[PDB]
Amino acid sequence: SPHGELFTLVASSLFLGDNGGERVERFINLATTLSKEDPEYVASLANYARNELGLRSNPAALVAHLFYSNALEERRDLILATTKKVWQRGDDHLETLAYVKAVGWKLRSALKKAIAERLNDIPPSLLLKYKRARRVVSQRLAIRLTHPRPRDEERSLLFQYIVKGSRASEEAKKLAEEVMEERPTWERIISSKGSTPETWLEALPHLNGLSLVRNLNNLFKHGLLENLEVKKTIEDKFSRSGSWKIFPFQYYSALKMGEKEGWPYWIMALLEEALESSAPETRLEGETLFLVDVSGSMYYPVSRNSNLHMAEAASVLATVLVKRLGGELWTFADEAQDYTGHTHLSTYSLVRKIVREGRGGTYLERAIRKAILDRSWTGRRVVIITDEQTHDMPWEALKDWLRSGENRVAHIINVAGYLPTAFPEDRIAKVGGWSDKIITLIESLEVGEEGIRNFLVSNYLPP
């Protein structure tokens, strides 16, 4: 299936880096074939990948392929809608330009015009925040290649500043430091004035959502969490936490740091409440059995910057999803342990308990027999999160359970990358690593190569 192959090639870049040998040449071939044969699918995939998977290079390349296909002339409105969905950040159109360069194509008029219109339309402060002045494909290069006719006086001056910087008129240099002086981000208050109780007090009104959550320790170390006006302001902000774009693991990461540092209980309680409320909406239906690897090897950091280890990340995900879908929550190492009787604890407390009670070796097949096979579990979906190494003839007990009922499916997420990302094969889908975007991936993989086309177009065709 070329539709399915292109999907998993794109999705796998979540684990093989956003960004050549086989995967480049196969990507080019599949994207060319599908932009000719099913441009709606290509456009929906680029939207999905940009905005559900958070990927940047693959969707920008898919946009390039649409511009160089029959869809340019036959479906210009689709191409415009797609660029509206894919060119989100100030440098995304630069990624499309970069791909066109990488593959050897001549930059064509329609793409030039689209980039030029984008150069005229991006908010000025965002166009300067993503100058990309030291990249090869910079905003300077884009302006010189696409020749935007400045719509506005300010835009003429922004172009001047971008293309020559120092050598620009002070008429333009001033406006450069003005789109940065007004409406300044909190990062600016702190970088310019430094890091003091008064500078963080000034930053706080501009601290919202994830930026607030991630900067609570800076507030704490300056004593600001004992300031009563700070408390009132953070309570006001957290009263709208339901509207934040934030994953459950980011609340858990904040709480864990609050444990280490001794944050006051009032802020911990706010974070615990926000974590408890953080179940995402999913297309998945039906009770689900989660089987979470908590062997010692899972106690490795998720990444260099994260304060989480893998067992924590996997447990956070499984706990939030099982509270949304219903079903069962098991972990496993030497033995399987059933936590379903404990889902009434807060998510924070349950995950802390799980990870505290984990560690050991990795006996996945034994766990599947205890948890799924011998108990004759009756739900239709199993999700296993593991770092087990590649065994030959793997999950035969799982296949046994999958054949013992109608429409059963399993997803195996291997956080060490020891599996590919694959649509269900013998009713087992596979995910090639860890990602905070696993839910939308499972959703897509569950519809199979037979449903992915209409699934992606009906859900994600650019409007």
Nearer to Ca ion, 105 or 299 (CB): 299
Least CB distance from residue 416 to Ca ion, whole Å? 8
Handedness of CA 163, 164, 166, 170 (dihedral sign): negative
Cβ neighbours of 303 (radius 10 Å): 10
The yes or no reply on residue 295 touching Ca ion (CB under 5 A) is yes
Cβ neighbours of 113 (radius 10 Å): 13
Interface stretch with Ca ion, choices 78-86, 229-237, 287-295, 393-401 (CB under 5 A) = 287-295
Nearer to Ca ion, 378 or 390 (CB): 390
The yes or no reply on residue 40 touching Ca ion (CB under 5 A) is no
d(CA 359, CA 355): 8
Least CB distance from residue 363 to Ca ion, whole Å? 9
Interface stretch with Ca ion, choices 197-205, 290-298, 351-359, 452-460 (CB under 5 A) = 290-298
Q: Which residue minimizes CB distance to Ca ion?
A: 362
Nearer to Ca ion, 272 or 387 (CB): 387
d(CA 258, CA 253): 9
Give ∠ CA 84-89-94 in degrees, rounded to 5. Answer: 85
Distances (CA, A) of 68 to 81, 100, 318, 361: 16, 10, 42, 52
At 355 the three-state DSSP class reads helix
Kindly give the pairing relationship between strand 336-338 and strand 381-386. Answer: unpaired
Interface stretch with Ca ion, choices 97-105, 229-237, 292-300, 318-326 (CB under 5 A) = 292-300
Least CB distance from residue 386 to Ca ion, whole Å? 5
Nearer to Ca ion, 275 or 384 (CB): 384
Interface stretch with Ca ion, choices 53-61, 177-185, 245-253, 288-296 (CB under 5 A) = 288-296
- Amino acid letter, residue 458: S
The yes or no reply on residue 362 touching Ca ion (CB under 5 A) is yes
**Sole residue written with tokens 């905070």:** 436
Least CB distance from residue 355 to Ca ion, whole Å? 14
**Sole residue written with tokens 């950040």:** 89
Q: Two tokens at 54?
A: 């958070």
The yes or no reply on residue 272 touching Ca ion (CB under 5 A) is no
Determine contact, residues 200/224, Cβ cutoff 8 Å: yes
The yes or no reply on residue 387 touching Ca ion (CB under 5 A) is yes
Give ∠ CA 463-60-64 in degrees, rounded to 5. Answer: 90
d(CA 45, CA 231): 44
Among 293, 312, 446, 449, binds Ca ion (CB under 5 A): 293
At 110 the three-state DSSP class reads helix
Nearer to Ca ion, 293 or 449 (CB): 293
The yes or no reply on residue 415 touching Ca ion (CB under 5 A) is no
The yes or no reply on residue 331 touching Ca ion (CB under 5 A) is no
- Binding residues for Ca ion (CB under 5 A): 293, 295, 362, 387-388
